[PDB]
Amino acid sequence: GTITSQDDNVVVGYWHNWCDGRGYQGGNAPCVELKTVNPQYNVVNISFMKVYDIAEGRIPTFKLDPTIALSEAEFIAQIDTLNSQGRSVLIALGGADAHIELTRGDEDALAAEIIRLTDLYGFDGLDIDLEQAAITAKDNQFVIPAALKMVKEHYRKTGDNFMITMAPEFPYLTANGAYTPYLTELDGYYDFINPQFYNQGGDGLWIEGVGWIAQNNDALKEEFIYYIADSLINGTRNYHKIPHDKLVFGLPSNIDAAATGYIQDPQDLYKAFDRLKAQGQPLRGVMTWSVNWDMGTDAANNSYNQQFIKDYGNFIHNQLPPVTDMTPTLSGIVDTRVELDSHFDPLIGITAKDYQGNDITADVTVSGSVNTNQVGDYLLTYSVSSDDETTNQPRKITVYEILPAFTGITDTTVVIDSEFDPMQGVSASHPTQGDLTANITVTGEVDTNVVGVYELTYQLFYGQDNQQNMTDKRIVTVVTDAVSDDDWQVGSTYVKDDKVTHNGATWTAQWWTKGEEPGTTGEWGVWR
Amino acid sequence: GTITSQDDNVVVGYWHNWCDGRGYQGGNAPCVELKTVNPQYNVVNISFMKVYDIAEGRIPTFKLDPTIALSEAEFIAQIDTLNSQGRSVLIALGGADAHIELTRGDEDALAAEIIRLTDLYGFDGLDIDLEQAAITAKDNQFVIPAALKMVKEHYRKTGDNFMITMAPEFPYLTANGAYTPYLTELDGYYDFINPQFYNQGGDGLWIEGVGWIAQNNDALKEEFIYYIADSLINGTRNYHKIPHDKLVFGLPSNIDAAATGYIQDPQDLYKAFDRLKAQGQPLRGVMTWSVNWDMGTDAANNSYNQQFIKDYGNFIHNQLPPVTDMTPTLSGIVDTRVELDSHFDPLIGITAKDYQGNDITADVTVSGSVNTNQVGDYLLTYSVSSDDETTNQPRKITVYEILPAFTGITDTTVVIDSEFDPMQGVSASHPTQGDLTANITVTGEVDTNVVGVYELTYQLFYGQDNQQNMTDKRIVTVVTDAVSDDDWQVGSTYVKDDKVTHNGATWTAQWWTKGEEPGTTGEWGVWR
Ligand SMILES: CC(=O)N[C@@H]1[C@@H](O)[C@H](O[C@@H]2O[C@H](CO)[C@@H](O)[C@H](O)[C@H]2NC(C)=O)[C@@H](CO)O[C@H]1O
Ligand SMILES: CC(=O)N[C@@H]1[C@@H](O)[C@H](O[C@@H]2O[C@H](CO)[C@@H](O)[C@H](O)[C@H]2NC(C)=O)[C@@H](CO)O[C@H]1O
Ligand code: NA
Ligand code: NA
Known part of the structure; x- marks a missing residue:
C-alpha cells in the first residue's frame, strides 16, 4: 500500500x-x-x-x-x-x-x-x-x-x-x-x-x-x-x-x-x-x-x-548486502585553454554534491595555480570531502597565445604623381588586444614622381611591451599615364617608318618586316 | 608521376x-x-x-x-x-x-x-x-x-x-x-x-x-x-x-x-x-x-x-598555411586502482612518441608518488618533452582494500554425544593474503553430552598485524536420538491412557478428548 x-x-x-x-x-x-x-x-x-x-x-x-x-x-x-x-x-x-x-x-x-x-x-x-x-x-x-x-x-x-x-x-x-x-x-x-x-x-x-x-x-x-x-x-x-x-x-x-x-x-x-x-x-x-x-x-x-x-x-x-559508496561528486572539471594574460578563476563552473545530492560546492578546495602571464600547461587538483570520504580530480589548464592579423597589405599599382599613403587600407588586430593599427611601422618609401617598383616592409609590433613582431611585404608599382607606340608583335607586318615599343625602347622599321624582333637585327638590320 | x-x-x-x-x-x-x-x-x-x-x-x-x-x-x-x-x-x-x-x-x-x-x-x-x-x-x-x-x-x-x-x-x-x-x-x-x-x-x-x-x-x-x-x-x-x-x-x-x-x-x-x-x-x-x-x-x-x-x-x-603542432604524445595513462600493500610501478604500461612517431618512452618522467601501504587517491603527473614542446598528463591511482570472506559458518544440528569440531568445514580467505583459516578464533563451546542450543561467535583477524576483524555467528543444536510419544494434535482424538508430548512434557489422557490442549486443562482436567 x-x-x-x-x-x-x-x-x-x-x-x-x-x-x-x-x-x-x-x-x-x-x-x-x-x-x-x-x-x-x-x-x-x-x-x-x-x-x-x-x-x-x-x-x-x-x-x-x-x-x-x-x-x-x-x-x-x-x-x-x-x-x-x-x-x-x-x-x-x-x-x-x-x-x-x-x-x-x-x-x-x-x-x-x-x-x-x-x-x-x-x-x-x-x-x-x-x-x-x-x-x-x-x-x-x-x-x-x-x-x-x-x-x-x-x-x-x-x-x-x-x-x-x-x-x-x-x-x-x-x-x-x-x-x-x-x-x-x-x-x-x-x-x-x-x-x-x-x-x-x-x-x-x-x-x-x-x-x-x-x-x-x-x-x-x-x-x-x-x-x-x-x-x-x-x-x-x-x-x-x-x-x-x-x-x-x-x-x-x-x-x-x-x-x-x-x-x-x-x-x-x-x-x-x-x-x-x-x-x-x-x-x-x-x-x-x-x-x-x-x-x-x-x-x-x-x-x-x-x-x-x-x-x-x-x-x-x-x-x-550492498555497502554504500558515500564518496562525494565533483562536476564541471574539464581541461580548459586560457589566453595569455586573461583572468582565470579556478572555481568558475565547478560544483559538488555529497552522496545524497546536497550541494557542497563551497566545500571544494583547489591545489596548484595558473600563471596566465606565461604560456604552458598548469595542473590543478580539486578536492572535496563529505561523510568521511574525499573525492579528488585533476584539471589541466593550458595558457596559449594567438597571432594577430594584418589586413590590406596587397601589391598595388598607382599612377605617376598621385598621392600615396602607405597606411591607407592597412590595419592589424588581435582577439584580446584589439586594434593594432598604431603598432605598424613601414620600412621603405614610394616615390610617385618616378616610374618603377617600390618595395615596402610592414612590421607589426605587439604583445607585452611590443616585443613580438610580425612582418609582411608589399610591392607598389608607379606607372606612367603617358601612352606610347604599340607593342611589337611577332605575328604582325610592319613597313618603313612604322614605330613599335619593345623591351623598353621605341624602334622604327627601315623596310618591310614580319617576325623580326627589335634589338636582334644588329647594326644595319630592319629595326633602328 | x-x-x-x-x-x-x-x-x-x-x-x-x-x-x-x-x-x-x-x-x-x-x-x-x-x-x-x-x-x-x-x-x-x-x-x-x-x-x-x-x-x-x-x-x-x-x-x-x-x-x-x-x-x-x-x-x-x-x-x-x-x-x-x-x-x-x-x-x-x-x-x-x-x-x-x-x-x-x-x-x-x-x-x-x-x-x-x-x-x-x-x-x-x-x-x-x-x-x-x-x-x-x-x-x-x-x-x-x-x-x-x-x-x-x-x-x-x-x-x-x-x-x-x-x-x-x-x-x-x-x-x-x-x-x-x-x-x-x-x-x-x-x-x-x-x-x-x-x-x-x-x-x-x-x-x-x-x-x-x-x-x-x-x-x-x-x-x-x-x-x-x-x-x-x-x-x-x-x-x-x-x-x-x-x-x-x-x-x-x-x-x-x-x-x-x-x-x-x-x-x-x-x-x-x-x-x-x-x-x-x-x-x-x-x-x-x-x-x-x-x-x-x-x-x-x-x-x-x-x-x-x-x-x-x-x-x-x-x-x-598550417603551423605544425609538434607536441609529443603520451599513451597508456589511465586511472588505476591498486590493492593496499601491492607493488605499483608508475611506468608500467606507459609509452610516448614525438610528433613524428618516434618512440620516446624513456624520456618520460613522473612527479608525485603512491604509498600502497595506505588507502586513498594519489595524483601523479607524467611529462615528456621533445622538439621544444612538453606534454603533461595527470593520473589518479586509488589504493583500495578488499574484505576477506568466511565460509562454512552455517547453523547446524548434531546428535547428542557425537564429536563436534567447531572448525570442521570453516575457512576464510582473502584475494591477496590468501588462506586465513588459521586466523579464525571461536568464542563459546558446544557440549554434545547436553541437549540444547549452543551459540558460537567466529572472529576472523586479518591484515597488517591482524588488527582488522570480521565476525560471524552460528547456532549448533544438540538433539537427542531418543524417540518419544507423539506430539499432541488439536485435530486428533485421544482416550484414557493415551500419551502425548506437548510443550516439552509427556501427558496422559484421563478420558475421551479432542481439541483440549495439554497444560490448559487445570488441576482436574483430561490431561495429566
Ligand atoms: C528497458 C527496455 O528494454 N526498454 C525498451 C523496450 O521498449 C523494448 O521492447 C519493445 O518495446 C515496445 C514498446 O516500447 C514494444 O512494442 C515491443 O514489442 C518491444 N519488443 C519486444 C521484443 O518485446 C526492448 C526490446 O529489446 O528494448 C528497449 O528498447
Ligand atoms: C568516406 C565516405 O563517405 N565513405 C562511405 C561511402 O561508402 C558512402 O557512400 C556509398 O558507398 C557505397 C560503396 O561503399 C556505394 O555503393 C553507395 O552508392 C554510396 N552511396 C552514395 C549515396 O553515394 C557514404 C554515403 O553517404 O558514406 C560513407 O559510408
Ligand atoms: Na507501493
Ligand atoms: Na603520384
Whole structure:
C-alpha cells in the first residue's frame, strides 16, 4: 500500500502493459498478471508511462491495457500484494518508440501527474527509460530531472523513499553522452541505474591486451561484462561513474527479448561479477527485459519457462548486502585553454554534491595555480570531502597565445604623381588586444614622381611591451599615364617608318618586316 | 608521376570507382573522368580498395571499373596530370559494405600490394575508410597499421612522404572508441584525419550552457562544428586528440550524398572555422563525399553544379598555411586502482612518441608518488618533452582494500554425544593474503553430552598485524536420538491412557478428548 523501496540486491524485471508481443526470433510474449511474476523479481517495472493521446497534451501518463483483463481495482490489488511481500513496483517512463517532448515549465505538471499515479496505483518509484529521440527531444533533459527532484522531495517529507532508477542504453553513458544530464542532475536522488547492455550490436570498448570487446561477441561476453562494468563503476575509459552499489546489469531474458545482447552461457556473468567482487566492487544486481519474455514462448511454441530467473535469481540474491559508496561528486572539471594574460578563476563552473545530492560546492578546495602571464600547461587538483570520504580530480589548464592579423597589405599599382599613403587600407588586430593599427611601422618609401617598383616592409609590433613582431611585404608599382607606340608583335607586318615599343625602347622599321624582333637585327638590320 | 603530398590546407574529394550511384533523395552520381575534377580539390581519393573476389584471398586490392570507359593506361595518365598540377591522388581503403577481414601475419602481403598499386598507378598515399564491422573485424586493427607503417618507411627511404589519412565516422573517435588503435599506432605516420561528420543522425555531444548538439540539427550546425572540432583538437569531452593542423572536416556534398549531415547554410561553417582560428587552432581543411555527388543531379534531374566547392573551395584555400603542432604524445595513462600493500610501478604500461612517431618512452618522467601501504587517491603527473614542446598528463591511482570472506559458518544440528569440531568445514580467505583459516578464533563451546542450543561467535583477524576483524555467528543444536510419544494434535482424538508430548512434557489422557490442549486443562482436567 505504501512506498516499498529496496535496500538489498535487486533483480529487476519489466512488465508489459500489452499482450502478445512479437519476438526478435518470432516468439511470443503474453501479457501476464502481476501476481504470477516470480517472487525473486523484487523490482517489477510497469511498462510504460507515455503520451497516449496528444489530444490530452504533452504530459505523459499511464493507462492500463484493458485487454490484460485486469480491472483498475484488481491491478491496484496485485501491486498491493507485491508490496505486502516487500517487493517494489515502479512505473517505467518511455519505452522504445514512445514520444515524449516536454518544454521547460512542464515540470510542475509532470511532477503532479507522477504523484497522482503513484498515490492512485501504489507505485514505489519511477524508471527513466527514454530511448532514441526522446532522450534529447525539446527540453526533456531539463524537465524530467526537475519534475523528479520535486517528486523525491514530496515523498521525503512524509518519510518515504520514492525510488528513481534509469535504463539508458549503455553507449549513452559516456562522459559527455546524451544521458549525462540525467545522471548529474539526479546524482543523490537515484537509487540505482540499470543500463541496457543489449540491442547495440557491435558497440563496446577497446581494452589493452584484449582488443575490441563488442556487446554482440559471444566469445568475449565475460570480458564485455567485466570491463564495461569496471569502467562504469570507476568512471574510466570514457564512461560516467555509477557507483557499484548503484549499478544493475541490464539484460535480455532470451533471444526473442532483444536483437543482440543475450548471454548464452551464464557462467560468463557469474565470473564477471565475481571478478568485480574480488576487486571490492560488487554490483547491485541484474535487470531484464522482461518478465513476460521470461514467461513466453519461442517460435516453436516452446515455453521459455523462467530460464532467466533460473540462471540469475539465486546467484544475485545470495550476495552480501550492498555497502554504500558515500564518496562525494565533483562536476564541471574539464581541461580548459586560457589566453595569455586573461583572468582565470579556478572555481568558475565547478560544483559538488555529497552522496545524497546536497550541494557542497563551497566545500571544494583547489591545489596548484595558473600563471596566465606565461604560456604552458598548469595542473590543478580539486578536492572535496563529505561523510568521511574525499573525492579528488585533476584539471589541466593550458595558457596559449594567438597571432594577430594584418589586413590590406596587397601589391598595388598607382599612377605617376598621385598621392600615396602607405597606411591607407592597412590595419592589424588581435582577439584580446584589439586594434593594432598604431603598432605598424613601414620600412621603405614610394616615390610617385618616378616610374618603377617600390618595395615596402610592414612590421607589426605587439604583445607585452611590443616585443613580438610580425612582418609582411608589399610591392607598389608607379606607372606612367603617358601612352606610347604599340607593342611589337611577332605575328604582325610592319613597313618603313612604322614605330613599335619593345623591351623598353621605341624602334622604327627601315623596310618591310614580319617576325623580326627589335634589338636582334644588329647594326644595319630592319629595326633602328 | 612521383609521390605528390600536400603541405598546405586541403579540400579532399572522394572519387567513385563506379557509375550512376543512387542518392539518398533519389538523385544520381555519374562516374566522371579524374581530369574533370575541379582543380580546387587538391586531394582526390579513389574509392575503393577492397576485396573484390574472395577467390583471390583476404588481401584487398583495386580494380578499375571498366564501365567508366577509362583504360588502365588512361587512368594512369589522368593521375599523372593531377600530379603534374601538384594535386594528390589517394587510394581509399574500405567503403560502406566493404568486407575486409585480415588476420595477423597478413600485414606483409597487405604492405606489398599497397606498394604494387602505388607504383603502378602513381597513387600518393592511402585513406583508411573502414566502416561498420570492417573497423574491428578479425585483426584489422593490428594488420592495417602494421602494413601501413611498413609502407610509410619503404617510401621514406627514397625521400617520399606516402600520405596516410583516415575517414572515421566521428563517434568512433571517442577515447576508447573503435578507431583508437588506428590513431595511436599511426601517431606520427598520418598526415591528417578527415572524419565523417555525417550519417550519424542524432549523435553528437552535450555542451554546458548550450545543451545537446546533434549532427542532424540544422539550427545548431555552427555549434556542432565548433564544439566537436574543439573537442577533437584538444582531446576533450571524451574525444581522442587530433591536432588542429591535422584535422579536416568531413561533409556531404549535398542532400543526395548522405542521409544526414549536409550543411544547409555554409555561413555556419565559416563561423565555426573562424572561431577555431580565433583561439589559435585553425583546421587543416574540409573533405567531401564526394566529387561525383558535387557533379551530379538531383531527383528532378537538376545539376548540383559544383555547389560544394563553390561554398568551401576559396574559403579553405584562402587560409594561412598550417603551423605544425609538434607536441609529443603520451599513451597508456589511465586511472588505476591498486590493492593496499601491492607493488605499483608508475611506468608500467606507459609509452610516448614525438610528433613524428618516434618512440620516446624513456624520456618520460613522473612527479608525485603512491604509498600502497595506505588507502586513498594519489595524483601523479607524467611529462615528456621533445622538439621544444612538453606534454603533461595527470593520473589518479586509488589504493583500495578488499574484505576477506568466511565460509562454512552455517547453523547446524548434531546428535547428542557425537564429536563436534567447531572448525570442521570453516575457512576464510582473502584475494591477496590468501588462506586465513588459521586466523579464525571461536568464542563459546558446544557440549554434545547436553541437549540444547549452543551459540558460537567466529572472529576472523586479518591484515597488517591482524588488527582488522570480521565476525560471524552460528547456532549448533544438540538433539537427542531418543524417540518419544507423539506430539499432541488439536485435530486428533485421544482416550484414557493415551500419551502425548506437548510443550516439552509427556501427558496422559484421563478420558475421551479432542481439541483440549495439554497444560490448559487445570488441576482436574483430561490431561495429566
Ligand atoms: C528497458 C527496455 O528494454 N526498454 C525498451 C523496450 O521498449 C523494448 O521492447 C519493445 O518495446 C515496445 C514498446 O516500447 C514494444 O512494442 C515491443 O514489442 C518491444 N519488443 C519486444 C521484443 O518485446 C526492448 C526490446 O529489446 O528494448 C528497449 O528498447
Ligand atoms: C568516406 C565516405 O563517405 N565513405 C562511405 C561511402 O561508402 C558512402 O557512400 C556509398 O558507398 C557505397 C560503396 O561503399 C556505394 O555503393 C553507395 O552508392 C554510396 N552511396 C552514395 C549515396 O553515394 C557514404 C554515403 O553517404 O558514406 C560513407 O559510408
Ligand atoms: Na507501493
Ligand atoms: Na603520384
